[PDB]
Design a binder for these strands. Structure first.
Ligand SMILES: [K+]
Ligand SMILES: [K+]
Ligand SMILES: [K+]
Ligand SMILES: [K+]
Ligand SMILES: [K+]
Ligand SMILES: [K+]
Ligand SMILES: [K+]
Ligand SMILES: [K+]
Ligand SMILES: [Mg+2]
Ligand SMILES: [Mg+2]
Ligand SMILES: [Mg+2]
Ligand SMILES: [Mg+2]
Ligand SMILES: [Mg+2]
Ligand SMILES: [Mg+2]
Ligand SMILES: [Mg+2]
Ligand code: NA
Ligand code: NA
Ligand code: NA
Ligand SMILES: [Zn+2]
Lengths: 85, 88, 218, 211, 104, 71, 122, 33, 129
RNA sequence: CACCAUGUUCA
RNA sequence: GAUUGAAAAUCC
RNA sequence: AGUGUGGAGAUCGAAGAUGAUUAGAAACCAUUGUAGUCCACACUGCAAACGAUGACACCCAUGAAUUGGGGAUACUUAGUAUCUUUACGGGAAUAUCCUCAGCACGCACGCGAAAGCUUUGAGGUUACAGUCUCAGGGGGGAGUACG
RNA sequence: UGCUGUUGCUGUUAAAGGGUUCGUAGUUGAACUGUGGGCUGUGCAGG
């Protein structure tokens, strides 16, 4: 005998694969990262699915490349995912 | 008891049909697929005793193929089955 | 004269099973008409031939004619059964029709229209029964209105034991085999519809074969 | 069904039973998945075969054993096998428990044709494979007969009431499962004791070429 | 009337496309759609064994090591021509559904 | 399928008015062409003068002469 | 066209089942036994029955045939097959060691009984 | 086959015949207008 | 597009009951849907139901006991006086012994028996039995 | 892949 | 007249 | 397909011509051939214009695929490789597991007079109400007549 | 005569979805302002 699914309290495995708008309560699939410029190590807050080209305030250097989702960060830069709240 | 009654109080129903224990549906006299499963009770030791627990399942559940799932659910509800293995 | 070939028939012959309601409760198929003959009291069961018509199959030399016969059996109190059988001769078809009608007996739920005074007179709820394209809808009726139905469904309802009912019919009702089957199915659904009276849980009971397994073995 | 009203842990699976299952590979599937049998699969191995949850297998085995032991007249239980690998297993199971059996081809109409003779009316049906023993299950669907099946990962669970997840393909696994079921039924009846191991051998349950 | 085939005899679903350019039949020249036409790719040996060995014995380049050339052609037939030439035959109602995804 | 609005009474009235003309009996009753073509002019009986006596051959499969009068 | 009709085949099979040690591989002695052991209005049928009985015996010497069940041979085969080995195959496998995969090892670790004694990962 | 009982000419040829009929009638009326 | 949230919810519940599910999810939700569900719960045709807040049109999870046969919505919401109760019962209900017609009266959303008891009419919302 | 048309009326 | 089961047709 | 006005005119080819075949055979078959076919611009609006299935919305069982875009490598959570690789190259394709949108396949109910349909309804309908719109009402006459 | 269908018709194949899109009348149209508390008695109340 196995556990029967509950519609009001979905399991972790069931809810993890759901589409962001098909979940029980919708939520963002994106986040923010703290990214250090590989030139002078200045730290800027960039967005995961950033469609614009992010320049550092000091280096004036591209820090990300737009794609069809989850913009690609420049080579040689460190990034840390900031907490959601 | 259970059934349709007069204002005089006498039971009027010809008979009281069995109800499926999974979906709560009256088991008709013509479906010919409904089963009656009796699980023997067990004492503190391994030997069974006289008492048994009875399950009724409607024929359409078996036709659909959900009879096994329904029986698992009913047995876990009655406490006959263990839903998960204990901690090591 | 009758030697049973089934456990239910053996129990009926040994008088371990007393009423048809015991069979109906456990949904056992009745495979011997002597079971119904024994369980229904003498003189209560009534049979009538609803319809007889010929059916033909074309053949290299002419065509072959068989006769299909419909029989209705009922004790006029909450029991109805319809049988249909085909034979080379009218008498053989009629006899097989009685056998099939006895085999296909079912219970009928009878309720009230308004207040519950005396014995029930009508069906407890609206029920529709469909065979082929013919569909027969039975609606509860007040006391004293009788059976407002076509002549063919009216006799089936009389044998089933209802007194007051409203009947509507759709489809090619001239197809009387389908009409009879539709009326039979509509009467059958009455004990299949769930009602707040039947919400309470009932304690399980032993199957008669389970209870008399040792007797049947010997 | 390892849970008892008193709460005793007598019926729980033990180390010896787990060793027997692992030795005879009763926990191996057939790399094909069925929706009804998905709950009984713990995971998929690197070779692609599915791995069956042994706790759930034991739960279903004990439930089937209790259902069979509840039958007062053992001849009312019919054990069927048509894949030529469970014939010896069901024959030995019938010897030990006391039930009836039918190996090989299942003649249509056995449960429904009440004239033809050789006509039986079992109260519980036991089958080695839902797919191979499809005729027996279909006939039991007409005469109010609950079905206990030994089902693999790709098993159609139509009209199957108690499905035991197991490897119903290998000779060793079929013999192991039937031996375990017979041992559990006898222990529940009280014919044998659970303290001393059963004297009977599963090699007898194993299928052997007659020639 | 009665829909004989659920795909109506052509490998074109309802909402897939509107028109498919027809092709001339290999035998009679009838213009039939490419999805409806019975298509077979044939690799025919240019000489049957009896004559191929006779040519190989006289050929200084052809033999066991070097094989003879073949003829490769895609033949698309109209339904009538395919049925007449027996590359495709009428089938029972039950067997009408079975299809082969490779040259067996 | 039909309209089910709460304020769709005009649409339903127009629909029924349009579709009633497809009934042959209703159209025949509500149109004067049938009454104009009817020799009786909408009367149950009519009086006339017997012009001549004739015999009309019955259609197949029957075979007889029916006595009629042109009036 | 020399096929044995179902009557001949059934009679010959019954003859073989009833008398097996009393039969032989030749036709003439088998027919001589047939005349006494069978009652029939015809001699052509007796000859055909004897011939097919000889054929059945020749087949039976090489191996068992479908439709004929000899009680003594069946009992001997059952007794031979019911021979119990000294030590169980499960016991041999457990003693030699049981090999399990990573996934099989996982639930054994997750079990309430824990990992069995003589099981190792492959 | 491919078509049920027509109970008459082929419908396409009947439509062509009626089309020619209408053409002739319109010509005759244009004549007398 | 979606025109009747209540009709969609009642159709979802009826389909789930026909299929025999243990519980069903209704999306979206509204006050009328919640009151209808509360009437059915009070009469016992459903059990535990839980409203999940979305910061939007929330959703509902309803646990179903096998007691409910059919529930549906009457569209358009025909106005029904205190004398039309018998006609509506004989039209849309299976019997005069059981089944309820849910009306939105000026005193709230209630079944036809309660509406007759309080002597008030209103617009017909739906039915259940 | 030459040609290969038609059967008075009811019954 | 023949013909047909009656007609038609034919012959007579 | 046809029409108008320019082009174009290889191929095939209504009409026509000739040769066959036939009792007949400007039918099928041969050999031709005009208009057409192709283009530009302007008409026409007559298809078995079909899925013979109106549009929008909701619910809806199973297994194997396929196209495009992403993402990952009544239980508090469950892996994963392969191949190419000096410039559309922090590349390309593969494997596994997801997700969203699309064409589908064999499919659970249910439905249908059946044939069949089935998350792609023809299902969720006498237990008949989500919304809007178009058509139909025995067979001809006749999509004719007249305007 | 649920063969005019508001109740209550039908349109894959029986009569009957418009070739397709846009589109005014017209008809239809997503949520949301909102659990009043306390007291005493009293209910196989229940957890
Ligand atoms: K498309
Ligand atoms: K097209
Ligand atoms: K016709
Ligand atoms: K000729
Ligand atoms: K002629
Ligand atoms: K040419
Ligand atoms: K109609
Ligand atoms: K508008
Ligand atoms: Mg044809
Ligand atoms: Mg055809
Ligand atoms: Mg047609
Ligand atoms: Mg000329
Ligand atoms: Mg045009
Ligand atoms: Mg008409
Ligand atoms: Mg049509
Ligand atoms: Na094709
Ligand atoms: Na000719
Ligand atoms: Na000639
Ligand atoms: Zn061709």
């Amino acid at each position: 005998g196995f556990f029967d699914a509950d519609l009001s309290y979905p399991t972790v495995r069931t809810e993890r694969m759901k589409h962001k708008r098909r979940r029980l309560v919708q939520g963002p699939n994106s986040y923010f990262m703290d990214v250090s410029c590989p030139r002078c190590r200045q730290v800027t807050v960039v967005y995961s699915h950033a469609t614009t080209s992010v320049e550092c305030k000091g280096c004036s250097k591209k820090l990300c490349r737009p794609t069809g989702g989850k913009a690609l960060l420049v080579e040689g830069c460190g990034y840390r995912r900031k907490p959601d709240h | 008891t259970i059934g349709m009654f007069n204002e005089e109080g006498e039971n009027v129903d010809l008979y009281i049909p069995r109800k499926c224990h999974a979906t709560t549906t009256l088991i008709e006299a013509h479906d010919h697929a409904a089963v009656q499963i009796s699980i023997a009770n067990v004492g503190p030791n391994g030997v069974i005793n006289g008492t048994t627990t009875t399950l009724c399942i409607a024929g359409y559940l078996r036709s659909q193929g959900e009879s096994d799932h329904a029986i698992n659910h009913i047995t876990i509800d009655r406490g006959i089955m263990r839903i998960k293995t204990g901690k090591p | 004269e009758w030697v049973p070939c089934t456990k239910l028939g053996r129990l009926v012959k040994a008088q371990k099973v007393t009423s048809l309601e015991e069979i109906f409760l456990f949904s056992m198929p009745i495979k011997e008409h002597q079971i119904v003959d024994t369980l229904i009291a003498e003189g209560q069961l009534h049979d009538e031939m609803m319809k007889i018509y010929p059916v033909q199959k074309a053949t290299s030399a002419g065509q072959r004619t068989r006769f299909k016969a419909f029989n209705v059996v009922g004790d006029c109190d909450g029991h109805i059964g319809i049988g249909a059988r085909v034979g080379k001769e009218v008498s053989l078809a009629i006899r097989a029709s009685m056998i099939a009608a006895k085999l296909n007996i079912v219970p009928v739920r009878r309720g009230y229209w308004g207040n519950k005074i005396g014995e029930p007179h009508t069906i407890p709820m609206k029920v529709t029964g469909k065979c082929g394209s013919v569909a027969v809808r039975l609606v509860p009726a007040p006391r004293g209105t009788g059976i407002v139905a076509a002549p063919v469904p009216k006799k089936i309802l009389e044998f089933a034991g209802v007194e007051d009912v409203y009947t509507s019919s759709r489809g090619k009702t001239r197809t009387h085999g389908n009409l009879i089957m539709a009326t039979f199915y509509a009467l059958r659904k009455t004990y299949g519809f769930l009602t707040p009276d039947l919400w309470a849980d009932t304690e399980p009971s032993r199957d008669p074969t389970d209870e008399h397994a040792e007797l049947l073995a010997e | 069904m390892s849970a008892v009203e008193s709460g005793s842990k007598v019926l729980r699976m033990k180390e010896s039973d787990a060793q027997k299952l692992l030795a005879m590979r009763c926990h191996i599937g057939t790399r094909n998945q069925s929706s009804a049998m998905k709950k009984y699969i713990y995971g998929r191995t690197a070779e692609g075969s599915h791995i069956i949850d042994v706790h759930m297998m034991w739960e279903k085995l004990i439930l089937a054993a209790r259902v069979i032991a509840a039958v007062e007249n053992p001849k009312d239980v019919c054990v069927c096998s048509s894949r030529l690998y469970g014939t010896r297993a069901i024959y030995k199971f019938s010897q030990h428990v006391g039930t009836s059996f039918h190996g090989g081809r299942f003649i249509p109409g056995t449960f429904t044709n009440q004239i033809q003779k050789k006509f039986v009316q079992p109260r519980v049906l036991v089958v080695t494979d839902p797919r191979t023993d499809h005729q027996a299950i279909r006939e039991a669907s007409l005469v109010n007969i609950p079905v206990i099946a030994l089902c693999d990962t790709d098993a159609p669970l139509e009209y199957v009431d108690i499905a035991i997840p197991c490897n119903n393909r290998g000779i060793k696994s079929i013999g192991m499962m039937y031996w375990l079921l017979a041992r559990e039924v006898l222990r529940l009846r009280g014919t044998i004791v659970r303290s001393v191991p059963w004297e009977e051998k599963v090699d007898l349950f194993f299928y052997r070429d007659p020639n | 009337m009665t829909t004989k085939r659920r795909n109506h005899g052509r490998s074109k679903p309802a909402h897939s496309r509107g028109r498919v350019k027809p092709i001339h039949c290999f035998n009679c020249g009838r213009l039939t759609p490419k999805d409806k036409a019975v298509g077979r790719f044939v690799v025919r040996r240019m000489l049957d064994a009896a004559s191929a060995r006779d040519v190989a014995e006289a050929s200084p380049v052809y033999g066991a090591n070097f094989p003879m050339p073949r003829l490769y052609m895609k033949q698309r037939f109209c339904i009538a021509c395919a049925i007449h030439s027996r590359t495709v035959r009428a089938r029972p109602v039950g067997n009408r559904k079975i299809r082969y995804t490779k040259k067996v | 399928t039909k309209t089910n609005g709460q304020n769709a009474a005009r649409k339903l009235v127009r629909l029924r008015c349009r579709n009633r003309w497809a009934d042959k009996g209703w159209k025949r009753a509500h149109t004067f062409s049938a009454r104009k073509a009817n020799p009786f002019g909408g009367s149950s009986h009519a009086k006339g003068i017997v012009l001549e006596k004739i015999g009309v051959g019955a259609k197949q499969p029957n075979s007889a002469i029916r006595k009629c009068v042109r009036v | 066209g020399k096929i044995r009709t179902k009557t001949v085949k059934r009679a010959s099979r019954q003859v073989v089942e009833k008398y097996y040690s009393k039969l032989n591989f030749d036709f003439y002695q088998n027919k001589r036994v047939i005349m006494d052991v069978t009652i029939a209005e015809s001699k052509k049928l007796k000859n055909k029955i004897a011939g097919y009985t000889t054929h059945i015996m020749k087949r039976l010497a090489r191996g068992p045939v479908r439709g004929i069940s000899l009680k003594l041979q069946e009992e001997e085969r059952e007794r031979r097959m019911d021979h119990a080995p000294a030590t169980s195959d499960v016991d041999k496998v457990i003693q030699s060691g049981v090999s399990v995969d990573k996934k099989t090892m996982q639930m054994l670790q997750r079990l309430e009984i824990g990992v069995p004694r003589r099981v190792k990962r492959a | 086959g491919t078509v049920s009982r027509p109970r008459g000419m082929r419908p396409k040829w009947h439509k062509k015949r009626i089309k020619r009929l209408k053409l002739r009638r319109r010509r005759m009326r244009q004549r007398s207008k | 597009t979606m025109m009747s949230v209540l009709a969609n919810a009642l159709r979802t519940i009826a389909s789930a009951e026909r299929r025999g599910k243990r519980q069903v999810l209704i999306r979206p939700s509204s006050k009328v849907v919640v009151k209808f569900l509360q009437v059915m719960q009070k009469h016992g045709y459903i059990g535990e139901f839980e409203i999940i807040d979305d910061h939007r049109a929330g959703k509902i999870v309803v646990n179903l006991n096998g007691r409910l046969n059919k529930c549906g919505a009457i569209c358009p919401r025909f106005d029904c006086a205190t004398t039309d109760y018998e006609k509506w019962m004989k039209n849309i209900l299976p019997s005069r012994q059981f089944g309820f017609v849910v009306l939105t009266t000026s005193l709230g959303i209630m079944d036809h028996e309660e509406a007759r008891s309080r002597n008030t009419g209103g617009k017909v919302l739906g039915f259940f039995y």
